[PDB]
């Protein structure tokens, strides 16, 4: 596999790193949404299922009705719009919530919807509230980044283990990252994301893939008819939780030789704290506000590293691309 869909300087660096680190027990970590593919799985699957009338205020787990709905005589507030209002309280509210909102469905069912969504290829209209007025928006379904697909594979081929650490529900992400049809070929056990309790509707048994994996009894097929529940397992794989996830599920001491992200706060803990001294920070720049945020973080963290007596690595080996460069 070769790095076709990459700017050549980006390709040279990745090639250097891959070559330097081949077959030595090394590993890499990718965020998923807007990093491994363009756009956002949950943020499109949610308004997609609403549109299909599958996911409605009526079926939403009561534990997720955290605030009153904002209904106009004209209009019932959508789940999508409710989500946006949850994020205005805080990221730490709406991040779990937008994974939990898929509770009530079995994995088989969600898998049908993900693939439906993945093949949809049209924008999905969603309504929200710009302050007080009903605004509207089209949300793109996810689009595989050819470059990431290639890099995932070339890493694997050179004996570099590939992990996904995602702020999205681990089961949803796995439905794309680990299904060969999408071409990433991640190992399903190597997909790490937001985990909620899965419930056996016959026995009442509660389980999660992370527990099965830690116990060495993971069977993905056996989980298909389990129902997603909202109850949150941890580490919650966002912000410092991404670094917690690496320590918990990957390695306590060995650092990834490559970390990929796109959201400065969500991905910055694993980018800055996780990435090995000589590893690459892979960055999908999709937004100026974000590019600026991460540049200030590079400056603050480089100075803090020096002040703390650590080698300055926060500013080393950035490989920065835009979505269009790797599509």
Binding-site residues for Mg(2+), please?
31, 33, 262
Burial class from Cβ neighbours inside 10 Å (0-12, 13-18, 19+) for residue 149 reads: buried
Of the two residues 176 and 226, which places its CB atom closer to Mg ion in the complex? 176
Spatial CB neighbours of 202, under 8 Å, sequence gap ≥ 6:
none
Question: Which partner, Cl ion, Mg ion, a copy of itself, none, binds residue 244 by CB below 5 to 8 Å per kind?
Answer: a copy of itself
Binding residues: 31, 33, 262
Say whether 316 sits in a helix, a strand or coil: coil
By CB under 8 A, how many residues form the interface with a copy of itself?
47
Q: Is 279 in the site for a copy of itself (CB under 8 A)?
A: no
- Residue choice 1, 56, 63, 295 for contact with a copy of itself (CB under 8 A): 63
- What minimum distance in Å lies between the beta carbon of 306 and a copy of itself? 9
What's the CA gap between 187 and 92, in Å, rounded?
28
Which one of 33, 40, 71, 265 is the catalytic residue?
A: 33
H or E element: which one contains 227? strand 227-232
Where does this chain bind Cl ion (CB under 5 A)?
167, 263, 266
Backbone region of residue 192 per phi and psi (left: phi > 0; alpha: psi in -120 to 50; beta: other values): beta
What's the CA gap between 4 and 227, in Å, rounded?
40
Question: Which partner, a copy of itself, Cl ion, Mg ion, none, binds residue 62 by CB below 5 to 8 Å per kind?
Answer: a copy of itself
Alpha carbon of 110 to those of 57, 67, 81, 98, 255: distances in Å? Answer: 18, 26, 21, 14, 33
Which x/- pattern over 14-43 shows residues binding Mg ion (rule: CB under 5 A)? -----------------x-xxx--------
Could you confirm whether 251 is annotated as catalytic? Answer: no
How many residues would you count in the chain? 327
Which residues within the stretch 255-274 sit at the binding site for Mg ion (CB under 5 A)?
262-263
- What minimum distance in Å lies between the beta carbon of 113 and a copy of itself? 24
What's the CA gap between 282 and 110, in Å, rounded?
30
What's the CA gap between 210 and 172, in Å, rounded?
14
Cβ-contact 118, 176 below 8 angstroms: yes
Which x/- pattern over 194-223 shows residues binding a copy of itself (rule: CB under 8 A)? ---x------x-x-x-xx------------
- What minimum distance in Å lies between the beta carbon of 319 and a copy of itself? 22
Backbone region of residue 16 per phi and psi (left: phi > 0; alpha: psi in -120 to 50; beta: other values): alpha
Which residues within the stretch 74-103 sit at the binding site for a copy of itself (CB under 8 A)?
89-90, 92-93, 95-96
By CB under 8 A, name the binding residues for a copy of itself. Answer: 61-63, 66-68, 89-90, 92-93, 95-96, 197, 204, 206, 208, 210-211, 229-236, 238-241, 243-245, 247-248, 252-254, 269, 272-273, 301, 304-305, 307-308, 310
Catalytic residues: 31, 33
């Amino acid at each position: 596999t070769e790095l076709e869909h990459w700017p050549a300087p980006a390709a040279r660096q990745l090639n250097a790193l891959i070559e330097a680190n081949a077959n030595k027990g090394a590993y890499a970590v990718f965020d998923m949404d807007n990093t491994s593919y363009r756009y956002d799985l949950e943020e499109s699957l949610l308004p997609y299922l609403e549109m299909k009338g599958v996911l409605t205020r009526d079926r939403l787990d009561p534990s997720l009705k955290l605030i009153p709905f904002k209904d106009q005589a004209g209009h019932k507030e959508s789940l999508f719009s409710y989500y946006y209002r949850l994020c205005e309280i805080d990221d730490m509210v709406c991040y779990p919530w937008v994974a939990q909102v898929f509770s009530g469905f079995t994995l088989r069912e969600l898998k049908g919807y993900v693939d439906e969504l993945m093949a949809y290829g049209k924008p999905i209209p969603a309504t929200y509230y710009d302050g007080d007025k009903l605004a509207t928006l089209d949300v793109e379904p996810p689009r595989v980044f050819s470059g990431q697909r290639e890099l995932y594979n070339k890493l694997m081929e050179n004996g570099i283990e590939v992990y996904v650490i995602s702020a999205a529900h681990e089961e949803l992400v796995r439905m794309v990252a680990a299904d060969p049809r999408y071409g990433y070929n991640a190992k399903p056990e190597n997909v790490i994301g937001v985990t909620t309790l899965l419930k056996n509707r016959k026995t009442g048994e509660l389980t999660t893939a992370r527990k099965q994996i830690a116990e060495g009894k993971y069977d993905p097929k056996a989980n298909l008819d389990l129902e997603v529940t909202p109850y949150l397992w941890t580490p919650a794989t966002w912000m410092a939780g991404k670094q917690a996830a690496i320590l918990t599920y990957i390695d306590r001491w060995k650092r990834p030789i490559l970390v990929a992200g796109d959201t400065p706060d969500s991905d910055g803990y694993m980018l800055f704290n996780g990435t090995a001294e000589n590893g690459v920070h892979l960055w999908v720049n999709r937004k100026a506000k974000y590019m600026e945020q991460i540049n200030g973080m590079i400056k603050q963290h480089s100075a803090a590293q020096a002040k703390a007596g650590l080698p300055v690595t926060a500013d080393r080996n950035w490989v920065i691309v835009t979505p269009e460069q790797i599509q």
